[PDB]
């Protein structure tokens, strides 16, 4: 009701975040996965990204 509490959040770094933590900074957006590289390494297993080479 209070027409006074927001401004374009359609694009750029502020539109987004990280589905685990909220960090706008350091986001892997590839493959529509949207994880900050610091939570990407802490999950990379459970997602299925592993280390062959």
């Amino acid at each position: 009701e209070n027409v006074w509490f927001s401004h374009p959040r359609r694009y750029g770094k502020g539109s987004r975040q990280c589905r685990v933590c909220s960090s706008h900074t350091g986001l892997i957006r590839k493959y529509g996965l949207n994880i900050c590289r610091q939570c990407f390494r802490e999950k990379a297993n459970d997602i299925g990204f592993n280390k062959f080479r």
């Binding site: 589905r19 493959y31 529509g32 459970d46 299925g48």
Partner: protein, 56 residues
Amino acid sequence: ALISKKRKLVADGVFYAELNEFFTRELAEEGYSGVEVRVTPTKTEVIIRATRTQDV
């Protein structure tokens, strides 16, 4: 529906990553130990592998 195959398979792994979490919190006092997710016709099946199934 209607997604790319890559995007689908990554998306499924994120679906795994999150589920494992939600259980790894929720069922701590029930000795939760991992999940598996099996897809079929009709249903979508998730099996909690935990060491106290009478409390789940």
